[PDB]
Every structure is written in C-alpha cells, then in structure tokens.
C-alpha cells in the first residue's frame, strides 16, 4: 500500500506534523541551542531521564508523542574516524526506535551539523548516514533544516536517488 517517502522542510522542527520528533541531543539530557532549544521550548518533560551515550538514542514519551533524543558526536571532541562511526550509530538507533515505536512518520534534523560540526560543513556526511539508517524503515521521513541553500541540496539529494 502506502509509499514510504523522504521530504525536506525548511522550518522549525518543533512545529513538525509527524508522529514523532528526533532531537539533536546532548548526552546529558540538557537544554541547548539549535534543535534542542526548540525541542526544549515545546517538550521540556521529554528531558526527564533523557541522558544517553553518544551514538545512541533514547525515547521519552510525552503522552502518546515520542521524542527521540539522538546524540550525535561532537566533532570538536571526536576524531573524524571515530565521529563517523558514532554518527552512523546514532542514526541507526533512531531507525530502531522509529521501527519499535510503530510510528507512521518522523521529523528529523541533520545530526552533528550545527554546534557539533567542529566548524565543518557536514551536510552530505550527516545526510548520507541518515539515508543509510532510514532507508530500511517504512516510516515517512521529514528532514527539517533552516538554511535555504541546505534545503535545496537536501532536496536534490533526495530527488536524485529515484
């Protein structure tokens, strides 16, 4: 039946229309800047016992609504090699949680492309790991970003696969 899809939206992920949200989290469950700022603004109870290791994800239910805290590596602290593995792992744990949760859709940002980027442009790296994990799930995936140029590039990368 229903065709699982990938979409990109340039808007605040906290305003998503999907059955769940992925927070670009930190490992201590602390409020922060960027995605986590918006997620904390809307779902602060989701931060109750959300602390989890780098490269893992941990879901906290806000009623019927899952907030998947996914912890990408900070590339200021991780080497390129070790960070690539942790980033891959975070997105794989996202896919496992999404499947487990039985959700029909998910709102997701590009992990480790903002305050955890170590100053590097990691759009293509983060998206590649996103695809590698998500591709085997049948949930509709909606990627959120804030930059116009990044929206275009993410959109192209989706479109050219098919």
Ligand X SMILES: Nc1ncnc2c1ncn2[C@@H]1O[C@H](COP(=O)(O)OP(=O)(O)OC[C@H]2O[C@@H](O)[C@H](O)[C@@H]2O)[C@@H](O)[C@H]1O
Distance CA 114, CA 69 (A): 16
26 is in an annotated binding site: yes
154 near ligand X (CB under 6 A): no
Q: Out of 20, 103, 145, 154, which residue is the one contacting ligand X (CB under 6 A)?
A: 145
Compute the least distance from the CB of residue 160 to ligand X, in Å.
Answer: 20
24 near ligand X (CB under 6 A): yes
Q: How many residues does the chain have?
A: 162
For ligand X, the binding residues in 100-119 under the rule CB under 6 A are 109-117
33 is in an annotated binding site: no
Distance CA 67, CA 20 (A): 6
Please identify, using beta-carbon distances, which residue of 74 and 137 lies nearer to ligand X: 74
For ligand X, the binding residues in 34-73 under the rule CB under 6 A are 34-38, 72
Distance CA 143, CA 131 (A): 11
Show the beta-strand stretches assigned E in the chain.
6-10, 21-24, 57-62, 65-70, 105-109, 140-145
Strand pairing class (140-145; 105-109): parallel
Binding site, annotated residues for ADP-D-ribose: 12, 26, 34, 114-116
Site residues (vs ligand X, CB under 6 A): 12-14, 24, 26, 32-38, 72, 109-117, 144-146
């Amino acid at each position: 039946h229903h065709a699982p899809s990938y979409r990109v939206k340039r808007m605040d992920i906290a305003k998503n229309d999907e059955e769940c949200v992925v927070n670009a989290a930190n490992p201590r469950g602390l409020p922060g800047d960027g995605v986590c700022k918006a997620v904390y603004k809307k779902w602060p109870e989701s931060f109750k016992n959300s602390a989890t290791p780098v490269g893992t994800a941990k879901t906290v239910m806000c009623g019927t609504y899952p907030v998947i805290h996914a912890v990408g590596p900070n590339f200021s602290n991780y080497s390129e090699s070790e960070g690539d593995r942790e980033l891959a792992a975070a997105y794989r744990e996202v896919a496992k949680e999404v499947t487990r949760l039985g959700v029909n859709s998910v709102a997701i940002p590009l992990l480790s492309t903002g305050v955890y980027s170590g100053g590097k442009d990691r759009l293509t790296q983060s998206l590649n790991h996103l695809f590698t994990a998500m591709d085997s799930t049948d949930a509709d995936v909606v990627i959120y970003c804030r930059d116009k140029e990044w929206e275009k590039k993410i959109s192209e990368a989706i479109q050219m696969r098919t």
